[PDB]
Design a protein around this ligand. Structure first.
Ligand code: SAM
Ligand code: SAM
Lengths: 340, 342
């Protein structure tokens, strides 16, 4: 009749084999290997690095959850769900579940949540020896993979941010923590007379240059490698913070906003774009954001924030909330000017 | 399926924050703390060992999943779900989720699942320094907590074992690997005429002696400390194996069946009570059993087995599979006898 069984509900929540069965199978590329059709375990185990027995058993669980079909014993075919796990797929989940990549690799922190509760700080260092940014920097290939994954998210959100802000009284925009520059590229091409500056890590900006630095919009952008905890390049009236504040704890997220305020001068405008948490939660939107927030606590030192917490940071960095809007999709867009 | 529906369902499957939030919060005793009613985070944080902000954010994820209530910001209260996580509770799930206890401790092995596909064998040693049995033996407190947690699963299935078998042909049963012996005890007083023996480790059985060795059932039961891989005690005409084979890789599980086949002699019984995996997809619990099988692979060297995986193992010990009937509660029961006859 209805969904009233508290015991069953608890069984849904406590499963930890399924999420790591899932991640592992994506890492070993089984969605790709079965995309064509039914494949028996001997074959799937050979191509990936796997023991046939173990893989049979891991796929059996995931087949009980509808990720794979098993029409006979030890043969596994594709489903609507496995389509979404393929590299092939337009909006693929692969970069977020692949343990080769840095994003899913950070989910190994889940086992250290107790220490995270004791110290109130991140546990990426406890899992891997160094905290997230340090070891993404010491392993460039991991850093490149991080940047490529983030570029997939940015690419979806770009056209919306470009439209979502007013660019009339803006002559030079700085994308601070802008990744490969997917958002800035859109802003500039949408507004032919804008100057741009991509500020990020050196190999990140350089990979961004290769991608679109030759294009019409690329010509009107300086690709400036560096750190946004230091002083920023001068002469930007607008600074753009698209999904960077939630990576950082309160003192560090503050320091970024200070450097952005410093960079834009008085009556300069710092433009923030995040998904913000909302007190009286809701269904799938708020639950997903609360999950993501624990990823921020464990991997990074960060946090998803409400509008009012964002306001407490802006006030301590000589800024004030001007115009809060929202993209027809849920991404909120806040413009901040200077005080006095 | 179609894209968005598939997408929704995948999000449920991929979530690793929730199940560790849940285990963290159970380890800290937050369900006990809110049993009386709403508590502020300040008090929860103070009474757990926790930073308030860290705990708050953990609790609001679990709030959106229905484990706790949050009626105003930063206050958390009990639910039907949290009631089941109290130590207090009769059907309590705390021992399966408390990371200070041995069961949930094993769940940390999930992060090394790729290594387990690489080699095939367990990764408890990779995670903790020793394989599951050896650091359970090296930490007496975990050893008792394991036996207390296994006795709770024994408690809910012992009635079904007694009525599920025919004890008429039996004189002296021996519950091999039987734990504290909740399955033997319910067997010995539901059948007054029988004798008993409980083989497990010495502190496991001496604790079982303290629990019910004084009772009327316990007077007829020899509480023997030992190892079921070595020669079993002499003079039983049946051996009982209640959820003991799924802990062991084929080769160790074989050795256990041989000692059971040897101990009873010809015209004896080896009675096996296990949850068996089905080739199709059962329902429900094939999902749950496939979940458990992955724990058995990662933590222990073990496996959930089909009837025929059992048949092969009993076969190689000179046993055949006789009667195969199933409990209402879903447990398969099989009487094994000597392979070759008359
Ligand atoms: C969430 S990401 C990318 C956000 C970007 N708007 C996007 O969606 O592609 C945050 C960015 O901050 C950058 N970052 C981290 N620490 C930094 C530092 N000290 N200086 C400059 N950039 C940094 C990362 O390299 C990354 O590109
Ligand atoms: C799954 S449990 C037993 C379940 C229990 N009979 C019940 O019905 O709840 C596994 C048993 O194997 C036992 N065990 C582990 N190593 C052993 C050894 N060397 N000798 C005897 N028993 C051992 C454990 O103490 C534990 O009681």
């Amino acid at each position: 009749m209805a969904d009233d069984d508290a015991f069953v509900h608890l069984l849904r929540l406590k499963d930890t084999m399924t999420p790591w069965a899932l991640r592992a199978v994506v890492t070993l590329g089984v969605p790709d290997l079965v995309a064509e059709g039914e494949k028996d375990v001997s074959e799937l185990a050979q191509r990936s690095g796997a023991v046939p027995d173990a893989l049979r058993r891991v796929l059996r669980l995931l087949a009980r959850r509808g990720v794979f079909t098993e029409p006979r014993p030890a043969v596994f075919g594709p489903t609507g769900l496995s389509r979404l796990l393929q590299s092939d797929h337009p909006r693929s989940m692969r970069p977020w579940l692949d343990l080769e990549g840095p994003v899913a690799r950070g989910d190994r922190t889940c086992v250290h949540i107790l220490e995270a509760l004791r110290t109130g700080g991140p546990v990426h260092e406890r899992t891997y020896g160094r905290p997230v940014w340090e070891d993404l920097a010491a392993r460039p290939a991991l850093g490149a993979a991080f940047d490529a994954a983030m570029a997939q998210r940015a690419s979806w959100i770009a056209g919306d941010v470009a439209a979502g802000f007013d660019w009339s009284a803006v002559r030079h925009v700085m994308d601070v923590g802008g990744g490969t520059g997917g958002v800035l590229a859109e802003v500039l091409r949408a507004r032919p007379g804008l100057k741009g500056t991509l500020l990020d890590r050196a190999p990140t900006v350089a990979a961004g240059r290769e991608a679109w630095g030759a294009s019409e919009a690329g010509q009107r952008c300086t690709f400036s490698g560096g750190s946004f905890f230091d002083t920023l390049p001068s002469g930007a009236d607008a600074c753009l913070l698209v999904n960077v504040l939630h990576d950082w704890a309160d003192e560090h997220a503050l320091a970024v906003l200070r450097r952005c305020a410093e960079a834009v001068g008085p009556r300069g405008r710092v433009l923030i774009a995040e998904h913000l948490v909302e007190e009286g939660a809701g269904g799938p939107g708020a639950a997903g954001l609360a999950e993501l927030d624990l990823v921020m606590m464990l991997v990074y030192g960060g946090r998803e924030r409400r509008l009012d917490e964002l306001a407490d940071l802006a006030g301590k960095a000589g800024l004030r909330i001007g115009d809060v809007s929202m993209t027809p999709r849920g991404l909120s867009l806040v413009v901040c000017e200077a005080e006095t």
